[PDB]
């Protein structure tokens, strides 16, 4: 990048002397001074200045080989024997150079270069060397020794190609996005499908999706799994499907193993995998029937695992979409999905030999009251979508009436207040707090507030959507504990009890206040559902729900909602608070609690208040 002085009007003018025309040229060109962007050379100088200004102890983390195993795992050759011999054609000699020794430098030079000419040259050389690797693999004598087994070179070359095909440079993307797809078309051929190299390629793609840095790489290897399926169920013969280590059953098994993993990126990877292969899954019928129930229970449990993560990873956003795809699959084939075949049994079920849509509706109904939020909402939504398409096509008002009568009333209350199915947890065993067996740690309090939210959302959805009338469940005929929980929360937790009056860090106060404010809003929505849905049975919500505690919480979230603990940094909750407050105050008008509401608002909103506010300078 040596840009000296060329033939400008400065040099030819200054060649005849030092006079006023050179001064004019300098006041033109030297004093342009508009702007200029930062170049790569200034960036390299700033990178050296950055590395110098971190220090000396922070500094040597650019050379991150400080573990001894990652030291010694970089001194061995990629393969012990030298493959890819190349006889260089001169006229008379043809000496042999081995292209294995150029592969580790060319791969890192094609990935990380910052110089576009070096990067493009490295990408072209790597492309032609991969072509040489594919040619030298299928050589003429025999598959054993006349063909060199270059599995050890494929195992390290495939992740480089996967990263280059999602590269931000236009040329390398145009160059390596077709090469990866052509490579999957070749390695899912009939000639090389039972190979160990197609296992290496599949392992490279499934290690690409779980990558915790590059979202572009995950998005591309999703299309790579989709292409693997689309060209592995087509080019081969259909009975040789279920004899390969890479068949669709084993692919879905490894997908489920990723889906229930404790690490969030592996679950996010399995979610992206189904979100890309749901089309080729839904268009094959001897595969969809045995697997759709198993896959739905796996992805619902993955979404339930996605509750305790950090909320910029977006495992929830991918997993709900995967569940919605399995849902719509169940919709299009429901007429056969409510026969009684022997499907592949989903995990956690009691054992059976028949699998219908019916015990899946019972399973979703069993897991409606689970603590984990988005899984609970998805379970409720799937139950309300799976009822009308069954034997007889009954509404949920009829179906739950029959199931309720042939099993008892407290079965439904046990599904709602009993938190989840794999435990006897919930607000049945903890209506109040007053006991949690310990020194009142904060993860316990969120678990109880989250159990209160679970039972509250269950009761509100089932009463509001007309499946079950409110009178028969909130009356004492099976001894629920919801109204005692709501009463305790509004009494001693809802108003002020941040970290001070919940023990009877400042950063942990916000994670408390979010879960407290959402259950305040959900108490208000449940109250409005009661007063709008049952205009005969407001007598039950007297000693607990609609009292001075609810009205104090309502006038506090009406006037100054920050004092309860709402944050004004959120905008969806602060835009939603008008609607829930207006709906509660509007439902409290066709009720005998109108007077106590008017006297609670008359204490906090007066004319003397308005005169006092505006008597100040504003």
């Amino acid at each position: 990048t040596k840009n000296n002085w060329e033939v400008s009007a400065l040099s030819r003018a200054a060649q005849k002397g030092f006079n006023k025309v050179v001064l004019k040229h300098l006041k033109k060109t030297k004093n342009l001074s508009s702007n200029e962007a930062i170049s790569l050379e200034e960036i390299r100088i700033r990178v050296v200045q950055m590395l110098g200004s971190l220090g000396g102890q922070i500094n040597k983390n650019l050379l991150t080989v400080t573990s001894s195993d990652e030291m010694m795992k970089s001194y061995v050759a990629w393969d012990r024997e030298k493959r890819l011999s190349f006889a260089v054609p001169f006229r008379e000699m043809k000496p042999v150079i081995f292209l294995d020794v150029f592969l580790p430098r060319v791969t890192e030079l094609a990935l990380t270069a910052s110089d576009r000419q070096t990067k493009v040259a490295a990408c072209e050389l790597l492309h032609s060397m991969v072509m040489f690797m594919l040619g030298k693999a299928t050589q003429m004598p025999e598959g054993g020794q006349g063909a060199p087994p270059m599995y050890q070179l494929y195992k390290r070359t495939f992740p480089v190609l996967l990263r280059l095909a999602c590269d931000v440079d236009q040329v390398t993307r145009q160059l390596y996005e077709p090469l990866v797809m052509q490579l999957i078309h070749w390695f899912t051929n009939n000639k090389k499908f039972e190979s160990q190299d197609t296992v290496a390629l599949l392992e490279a793609i499934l290690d690409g999706i779980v990558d915790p840095v590059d979202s572009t790489l995950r998005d591309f290897c999703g299309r790579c799994i989709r292409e693997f399926l689309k060209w592995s169920i087509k080019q081969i013969t259909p009975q040789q499907q279920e004899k390969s280590p890479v068949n669709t059953k084993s692919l879905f098994k490894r997908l489920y193993s990723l889906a229930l993993h404790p690490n969030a990126f592996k679950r996010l990877g399995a979610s992206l995998a189904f979100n890309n292969i749901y089309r080729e899954f839904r268009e094959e019928e001897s595969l969809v029937e045995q697997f759709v129930f198993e896959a739905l229970v796996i992805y619902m449990e993955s979404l339930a695992l996605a509750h305790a993560d950090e909320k910029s990873l977006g495992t929830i956003q991918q997993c709900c979409d995967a569940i919605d795809h399995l849902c719509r699959i169940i919709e299009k084939k429901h007429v056969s999905l409510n026969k009684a075949k022997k499907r592949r049994l989903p995990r956690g079920f009691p054992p059976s030999a028949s699998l219908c849509l019916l015990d899946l509706v019972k399973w979703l109904l069993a897991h409606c009251g689970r603590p984990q939020t988005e899984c609970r909402h998805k379970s409720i939504e799937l139950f309300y979508k799976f009822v009308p398409l069954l034997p007889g096509n009954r509404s949920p008002n009829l179906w739950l009436k029959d199931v309720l009568k042939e099993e008892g009333v407290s079965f439904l209350i046990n599904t709602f207040e009993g938190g989840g199915c794999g435990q006897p947890s919930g607000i049945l065993a903890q209506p109040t707090l007053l006991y949690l067996r310990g020194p009142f740690s904060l993860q316990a309090t969120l678990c109880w507030l989250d159990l209160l939210l679970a039972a509250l959302e269950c009761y509100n959805t089932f009463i509001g959507e007309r499946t079950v009338g409110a009178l028969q469940v909130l009356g004492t005929e099976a001894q629920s504990s919801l109204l005692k929980a709501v009463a305790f929360f509004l009494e001693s937790i809802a108003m002020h009890d941040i970290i001070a009056a919940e023990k009877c860090s400042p950063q942990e106060g916000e994670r408390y206040n979010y879960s407290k404010c959402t259950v305040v809003v959900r108490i208000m929505e449940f109250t409005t559902t009661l007063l709008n849905t049952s205009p005969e049975g407001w007598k039950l919500l007297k000693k607990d729900l609609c009292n001075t505690h609810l009205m104090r919480v309502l006038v506090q979230t009406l006037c100054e909602p920050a004092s309860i603990g709402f944050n004004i940094g959120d905008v969806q909750v602060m835009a939603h608070l008008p609607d829930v407050c207006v709906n509660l105050m509007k439902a409290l008008k066709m009720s005998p609690y109108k007077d106590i509401l008017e006297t609670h608002l008359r204490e906090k909103i007066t004319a003397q208040s308005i005169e006092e506010l505006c008597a100040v300078n504003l």
Binding site: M72, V76, A77, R254, S257, H261, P262, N263, L345
Partner: protein, 886 residues
């Protein structure tokens, strides 16, 4: 000026940490002037000086260590207390811990050689006597008074330290000083001294557990000292240890969970019970297999105390095993053993039972019941298409050839029981087949099928015990593979594969036949070893660590070894390197070393058997052995390992890195196997990682010194240093890198001798089966030591092995330990005098002979210990399978 002062002080700290005391002394000498301008600068200066003088007084011996540290007490009981050592509590803590280490250094300089007190200077000697406070003695109370001064200052440091990373160090230095003071009196016979050290064990135990509660590795490696100190001081420290464990978090004992569940029978199992029951609560997959192995020998000793321990063990058993899925896995692994081997072990143990008078049926029923439950009754707990083929052709030769067990076999008839047992064994070693796939081997593991309802089994070997466990990440069993290969090796274990739930293959080695707790305690000692090296600075520079794998003993005669992947054995690395003529001329040539050794043995003895050795020991001099060993050793190809490393490396940089890592790791495992003396180090007991080049040592069967006791030919070399190792280092020799790594490792081991010899308490507390069997085979003969050691005292055999190990790690000639082991095991052999005269040297042609019997030095020990390991006189008379030419 303040910035320039602070930067120079930080440079002085770095120069002290890098052992640049001659530069740090100059840089600190030119800051003595400016330090007096403030009080902060004076305190920081004198602390830098005193810490530099403490780091400087390590290489200097006595009468030069005491001089270097004596100038730093002259200015520390001086000023700066005026409103600054009262305002700063951290400067007070550092001040007190510095002066405590000062007095400790003086008192330990005046204790190994207390003839140096007036051998320095009179003004300075009077300074020593006036510093202690005691007066008019020679050596009797000045050292005790300096010790009391050190303890006083360290206790003040802990009191000023209680108001982590700052209090852990004062805790540990006080507990280390007090544990050293408790250990110093074990070899002195005094009650005044015990009466002035009796206040110490509480301030050892409480302070060490209060350090361990703040997540400290250095207190976690000193936990067997805590479990040992109650056996010595039970009445002032048992309830303190009981209440002080209970605040320590749940997981800092999972590494020590084979000490605890084996101490769970003794009369100290009250301080351990809360931790055992809560590990059983939180992690009921770590403690299960140690409980199942430990529960076979408890002997509860009926008192008013022992019923509580019986009920505790019963409640722990009730809290574990929860559906019998672990016991089913154990009983399903017990099916993939060859029944012929189990018959062989049964016959050997029955013969050991009958070879002692007054042999009774009170303990022959207990042997017949298990062999009838295993190799008798066909309606079993479980078996497959191998055991039924065994039983329906050989169980009918048991009910008439012995008959019913405890009604017909009970005659003495050791001549006649051996007759019929051999007459059945000679047909039992002619029908066994290598069992094929798992559909015929164990029809539980084939159709394992995880989904019973919920019985989740982890794959064993996990829970390393160095942090919070997080048991969700541990891979669990979700199937088995349908392949098992049986490796011959004179004893046949089985390579299986445990398919995890993450769709991965986890290969394990299942061996049946031997107790596997000895491998587990050796690997625990290696884990303590490479935790010792990690805190030593010269070894943490070179990053010396021992490669350990996980050994899970389930019951006796059943265990799981982790199978490491992409390694090869050393003999396979050396045989794959050879070309076609080299491998042919090594495996098949009358002039090859594998045959020439047998021919030369017959020409020196006349016999063909194992007796050819014992007739060529006394029968041959030095020169006929040394020149024939050189002529044998010159037949194999020379540079095999260099050829392997050139073939596996990219460039000259990579070849140097792989060769340095190989030589460094092998030189570390040489000194590590010698410290706890391991034999049977042939080339199929070394494994090399083919991705890193490092060496892994396996098979710790002859764990403490036993290849030169219980073998028909003794192994006189301390480790493996044959020709193919020392030609890797060419053009240089073994006296460079391998020697220097051995010096650094042995110096770190002998820095704190307590840790390795305190971890070995499990060897004497819960002795293995092969150690009690070696105790009976040692009590059979009797020799010189019987009139020296007490046989009615204790278990006494692992106490003797710990005595040998501690004795060689206290500085000892390796020639002496080896001939002591030949004295202990090989008495009344015809060639015992020649055994000692080979294993001791030749006094002009060795260095291990012109050295003192003990008191040996750090470099001198490995200098006479490499001499023994590469000696043509010793290497010319070694077992043929060892291959000492390679």
């Amino acid at each position: 000026r303040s910035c320039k002062f602070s930067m120079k002080m930080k440079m002085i700290d770095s120069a002290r940490k890098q052992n640049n005391f001659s530069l740090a002394m100059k840089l600190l000498k030119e800051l003595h002037k400016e330090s007096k301008t403030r009080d902060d600068w004076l305190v920081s200066w004198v602390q830098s000086y005193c810490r530099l003088s403490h780091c400087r007084s390590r290489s200097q011996g006595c009468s030069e260590q005491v001089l270097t540290v004596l100038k730093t007490v002259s200015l520390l009981d001086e000023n700066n207390v005026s409103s600054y050592l009262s305002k700063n509590i951290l400067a007070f803590r550092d001040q007190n811990i510095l002066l405590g280490t000062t007095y400790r250094i003086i008192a330990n300089a005046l204790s190994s050689e207390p003839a140096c007190l007036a051998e320095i200077e009179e003004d300075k000697a009077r300074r020593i006597l006036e510093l202690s406070g005691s007066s008019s003695e020679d050596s009797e109370k000045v050292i005790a008074g300096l010790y009391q001064r050190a303890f006083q200052h360290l206790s003040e440091a802990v009191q000023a330290a209680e108001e982590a990373a700052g209090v852990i160090d004062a805790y540990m230095t006080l507990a280390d000083f007090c544990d050293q003071q408790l250990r110093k009196e074990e070899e002195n016979a005094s009650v005044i001294d015990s009466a002035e050290l009796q206040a110490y064990p509480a301030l050892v135990v409480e302070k060490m557990l209060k350090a361990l509660k703040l997540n400290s590795n250095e207190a976690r490696l000193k936990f067997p000292r805590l479990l040992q100190i109650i056996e010595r001081y039970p009445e002032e420290t048992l309830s303190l240890m009981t209440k002080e464990i209970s605040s320590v978090p749940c997981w800092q004992f999972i590494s020590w969970i084979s000490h605890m569940v084996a101490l769970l029978d003794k009369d100290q199992a009250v301080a351990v019970q809360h931790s055992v029951e809560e590990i059983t609560d939180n992690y009921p997959q770590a403690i299960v297999y140690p409980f199942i192995i430990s529960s076979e020998s408890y002997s509860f000793k009926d008192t008013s105390t022992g019923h509580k321990n019986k009920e505790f063990v019963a409640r722990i058993k009730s809290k574990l095993d929860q559906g019998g899925v672990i016991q089913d896995f154990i009983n399903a692994l017990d099916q993939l053993s060859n029944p012929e081997l189990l018959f062989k072990d049964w016959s050997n143990d029955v013969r050991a039972e009958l070879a002692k008078t007054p042999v009774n049926k009170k303990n022959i029923e207990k042997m017949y019941e298990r062999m009838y439950a295993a190799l008798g009754d066909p309606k079993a707990p479980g078996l497959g298409a191998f055991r039924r083929k065994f039983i329906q052709t050989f169980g009918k030769e048991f009910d008439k050839h012995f008959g019913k067990g405890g009604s017909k076999l009970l005659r003495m008839k050791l001549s006649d029981f051996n007759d019929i047992t051999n007459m059945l064994l000679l047909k039992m070693n002619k029908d066994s087949k290598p069992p094929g796939n798992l559909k015929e081997c164990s029809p539980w593991m084939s159709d394992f099928k995880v989904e019973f309802l919920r019985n989740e089994l982890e794959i064993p070997g996990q829970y390393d015990g160095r942090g919070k466990p997080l048991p969700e990440y541990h891979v669990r069993i979700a199937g088995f593979d349908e392949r098992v290969t049986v490796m011959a090796s004179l004893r046949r274990p089985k390579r299986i594969i445990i398919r995890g739930h993450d769709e991965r293959e986890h290969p394990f080695l299942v061996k049946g036949g031997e107790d596997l707790r000895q491998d587990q305690r050796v690997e625990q000692l290696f884990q303590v070893m490479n935790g010792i090296l990690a805190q030593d600075s010269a070894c943490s520079q070179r990053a010396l660590q021992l490669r350990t794998y996980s050994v899970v003993p389930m019951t006796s005669r059943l265990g799981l070894i982790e199978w490491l992947e992409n390694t090869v054995t050393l003999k396979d690395l050396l045989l794959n390197t050879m070309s076609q003529e080299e491998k042919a001329a090594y495996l098949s040539d009358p002039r090859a070393p594998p045959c020439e050794y047998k021919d030369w043995l017959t020409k020196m003895s006349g016999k063909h058997d194992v007796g050819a050795y014992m007739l060529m020991y006394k029968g041959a001099n030095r020169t006929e052995t040394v020149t024939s060993f050189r002529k044998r050793e010159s037949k194999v190809p020379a540079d095999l390992l260099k050829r392997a490393f050139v073939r596996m490396s990219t460039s000259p940089e990579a070849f140097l890195a792989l060769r340095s890592h190989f030589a460094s790791s092998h030189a570390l495992i040489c000194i590590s196997h010698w410290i706890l003396g391991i034999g049977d180090r042939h080339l199929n007991n070394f494994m090399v990682a083919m991705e890193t080049g490092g060496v892994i040592g396996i098979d710790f069967g002859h764990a403490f010194g036993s290849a030169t006791q219980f073998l028909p030919v003794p192994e006189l070399m301390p480790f493996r240093l044959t020709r193919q190792f020392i030609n890797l280092m060419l053009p240089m020799k073994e006296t460079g890198l391998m020697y220097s790594i051995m010096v650094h490792a042995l110096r770190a081991f002998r820095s704190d001798p307590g840790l390795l010899t305190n971890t070995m308490d499990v060897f004497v507390k819960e002795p293995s089966f092969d150690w009690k069997n070696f105790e009976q085979k040692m009590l059979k003969k009797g020799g010189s030591w019987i009139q020296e050691i007490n046989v009615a005292e204790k278990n006494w055999y692992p106490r003797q092995k710990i005595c040998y190990a501690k004795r060689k790690l206290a500085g000892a000639n390796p020639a002496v330990i080896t001939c002591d082991e030949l004295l202990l095991g090989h008495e009344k052999a015809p060639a015992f005098r020649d055994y000692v005269a080979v294993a001791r040297g030749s006094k002009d042609h060795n260095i291990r002979a012109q050295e003192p019997e003990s008191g040996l030095s750090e470099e001198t020990q490995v200098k006479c210990l490499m001499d023994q390991a590469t000696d043509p006189n010793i290497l010319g008379r070694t077992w043929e399978g060892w291959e000492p030419w390679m």
